[PDB]
Amino acid sequence: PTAREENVYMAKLAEQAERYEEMVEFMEKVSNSLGSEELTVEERNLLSVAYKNVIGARRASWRIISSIEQKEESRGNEEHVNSIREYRSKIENELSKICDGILKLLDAKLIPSAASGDSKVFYLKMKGDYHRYLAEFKTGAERKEAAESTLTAYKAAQDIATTELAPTHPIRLGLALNFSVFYYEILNSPDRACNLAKQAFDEAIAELDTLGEESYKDSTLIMQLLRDNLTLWT
């Protein structure tokens, strides 16, 4: 069987069972307990999924709790607000911890060992994403640093993608999607956002006839997501 293989099998089982904390642990075991090889395409994917699911449940809790705090602040109900805030801290504690897990692995192994430009772009996107989720709830200097750290990882990842990866490449298309959302949501810049999405979109469109059956599903899907953000924003 091998040590790296059934951990992978276990991570697939945990995915099916919708038990994402366990999924992460399995992919961790896989990840640092290799050496200096890269993660395989399927391992990369399973990692980013495992973390996205764990973090998203908390993102969703934080939004709903953060919205109730605000409505209870209008009503003048000051005690509810104290209780809610304290809960909100608990969820924020979890968020900082989760982000720290992935950001630690990315800086220590994953970014330093990516050899193909595909992979450099992949892990630099991930790093961008996790800082972006710190910038969603941190405030003041903590926010300012998360936002700065985000901009540079996306900037780096952009500078490589435009010059080495096809315009239709799903990982290139993914960077542009999140990068545009980062501007819209973090930096309150609708127009930078619109134009960055639109350009990425049109550039993919002009290369369409040469798009592999291998990347077809994912590319067409990220192309629709770029269109939907545009439509909602516009």
């Binding site: 993914g174 999140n178 899907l221 997501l225 953000n229």
Partner: peptide, 5 residues
């Protein structure tokens, strides 16, 4: 609220 991947 925006779509990401």
């Amino acid at each position: 609220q925006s779509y990401t991947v």
